[PDB]
Amino acid sequence: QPITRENFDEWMIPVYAPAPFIPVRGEGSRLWDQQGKEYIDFAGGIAVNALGHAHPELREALNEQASKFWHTGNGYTNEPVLRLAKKLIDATFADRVFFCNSGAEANEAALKLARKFAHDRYGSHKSGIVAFKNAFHGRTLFTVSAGGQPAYSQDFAPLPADIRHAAYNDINSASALIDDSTCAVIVEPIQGEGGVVPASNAFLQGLRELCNRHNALLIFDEVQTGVGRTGELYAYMHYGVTPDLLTTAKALGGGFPVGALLATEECARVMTVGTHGTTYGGNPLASAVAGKVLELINTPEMLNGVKQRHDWFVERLNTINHRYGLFSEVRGLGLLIGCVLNADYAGQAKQISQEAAKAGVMVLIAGGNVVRFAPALNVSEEEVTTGLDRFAAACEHFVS
Amino acid sequence: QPITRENFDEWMIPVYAPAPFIPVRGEGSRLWDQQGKEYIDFAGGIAVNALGHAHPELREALNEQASKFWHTGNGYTNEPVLRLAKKLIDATFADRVFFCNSGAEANEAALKLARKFAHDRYGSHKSGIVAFKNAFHGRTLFTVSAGGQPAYSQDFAPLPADIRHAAYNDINSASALIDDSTCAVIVEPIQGEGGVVPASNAFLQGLRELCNRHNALLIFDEVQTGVGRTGELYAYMHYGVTPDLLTTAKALGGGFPVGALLATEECARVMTVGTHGTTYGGNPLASAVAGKVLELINTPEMLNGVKQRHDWFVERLNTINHRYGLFSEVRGLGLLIGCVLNADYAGQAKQISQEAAKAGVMVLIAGGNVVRFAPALNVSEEEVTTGLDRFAAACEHFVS
């Protein structure tokens, strides 16, 4: 009758090795497990819970809609999805929006759009997708092939063709591969799963120029960096560089699964009826929640609060690092932050993460070499201080 | 300030041409638009709203969970997702489950699993996927290439390689393509988007034998046919044939986006840590709702009620067809039903569907030649009678 962690190994296809403990409830940046142990949540659902757990406003938005209707599919549109498209359109470089269920699906849409756009304006010979080493764009066949970790793509071959990977942050690597045959350049403004590595300002200017020069669409995968995470609504705003396509998901639904492709008028025009689609994308429920999310997150008091919190994190992480000497650098932007291990401790991010869990704070990794922080954007000063106290206890246990 | 249908053409990437009217609320099999016109909903969200609109029980399940927590991502499991895995395991041939956000993602998982399984037990040369003409498996690059409507895949080339299509319901077509190099045979037990065409009993026995003989995994895409739609929990039960992998989505979450891959112990074992994944899949919210759905749908009174309703539909559709002579045949199973147009009216399913909307009933199409019905499983006798009255009015207007 009771549910146990041993139940997980018996019943789930074993793609994840999750925590020994099982969460049963949360509020804000706190989470509790079956035994009532209390965690401070700096993982934030992997950058998804931008307003923390069980937020009262997301809850009324969800239940208000849920009492009218949840879903019709896309033969019918709805008021929530349309208010949401509008909020996005007004807030970003975008003119049109397409909604779906996840980051992976949004990137699939973006790449398909790019392929179609080049076939239609230039010719069927123009198919190349240029992405970057260590990129993560999701787990579908297409998006994992565009993603730059061959370990996640090897087994599933033959992979869609005409994808090449340049070195992140290397403008020369990219120009080597970008030419008149390229339809798309897909890039994360900050590499998330790949070590929390920010783009340099030059690198994104350079890509934009290469795109212009060669008529490829520039796609920014802001699935991990979007919706306030950097201190601005999107990273493209921080950098000053405008993409042709922008994918967003994750924080956008603050816990409810949703993704979006933002596009210029020129690009959208090309996706005609029946050329793509989704069954659940743009449903009333998801749209009512993301709508509320945008409204709460897209305010100067929140966004400025993100930069404030960045400083809380960085200051205290350095104090900590000065004492214990784990990290060679602390990097990232707003509230996507990475502590990179120095060579003494290389490859042990996971162990530190497990130590943190024992001390009662949830952090992530980003490769074996980086401890990743992605707390809720409305994380309180007190939760930050407590959670960093626990993280420090953890670093102590770990150093031995 | 008010939201209008003209707003849809201004703001959405135009992949859908939805209805002139916009739904604002529903209850059961009734839906209302902005002007308060009343529709009977035989489209049921494209076979998704198995318990109709804004169902009171789905609502408390949703709000109960939503007050504990919505999401952590998969470094952490949860009680809802585990109760759900268990319900499924107990109810089906499956031993293990993997959860995701949609049918498309579930099929991506299934095919990737199959590719990996063959690479691991036989060798990297064994990669072939055999699917069928007119199959629909979703809109990712991989699943649309496995899908059998070249119009939806052409523009996005180069497509993943080693996919071939046999003729549905043709055992000889399939044996021509299935050999020792095949890793997977993916099939819909009833082709949904492709004309509501049921599989013959022979055809699925035959595929199962071919699979066994050649060591390919048999995958049944029950995304459209699963969760009661046929009168049994899944179509594989109606047919007597057990697949190796089963994908399900759609009705499973009764409106909330969710998909699942059901697998035998032998197959699951092969998907090791980090080989696949999803950010939202298996989240508490989705799992609490599908859990309730399964509990309401997987009962002899519902399932038997589905067969009862099948008869209501078929009887009255024939009365109607005898009067107006639109349809050459009425086909399908349980509450997935197709009225196939005779040659006089070929290609005009969409027009009939538009006539139906004017008369105040929502039906679907399945190609230009078939009017498709997928009402909620708990559709009441009265809603069925009223909606078929309106459908009949519609058929009258249409015949001229």
Residue numbers in the entry:
A (entry chain A), B (entry chain A): 3 to 402
Task: Show sentences the authors wrote.
Escherichia coli possesses two acyl ornithine aminotransferases, one catabolic (AstC) and the other anabolic (ArgD), that participate in L-arginine metabolism. The arginine-succinyl transferase pathway of E. coli provides nitrogen for growth via a series of succinylated intermediates. In conclusion, the E. coli AstC protein, involved in arginine catabolism, is a PLP containing transaminase that is structurally similar to the related protein ArgD, which is the transaminase enzyme used in arginine synthesis. From the biochemical data, it appears that AstC and ArgD are biochemically similar, consistent with the ability of astC to complement an argD deletion.
We were able to obtain crystals of the apo-protein, although they diffracted to only medium resolution (2.75 Å). Consistent with our spectrophotometric data, there was no electron density for the PLP co-factor in the crystal structures of protein obtained directly from purification. The St-ArgD structures are most similar to the B protomer of the apo-enzyme structure of AstC reported here, in that the N-terminal ∼23 amino acids of the structures are missing as are six residues in a loop from 277–282. The reconstituted enzyme was more heat stable than the apo-protein; holo-AstC and apo-AstC had apparent Tm values of 46°C and 43.5°C, respectively.
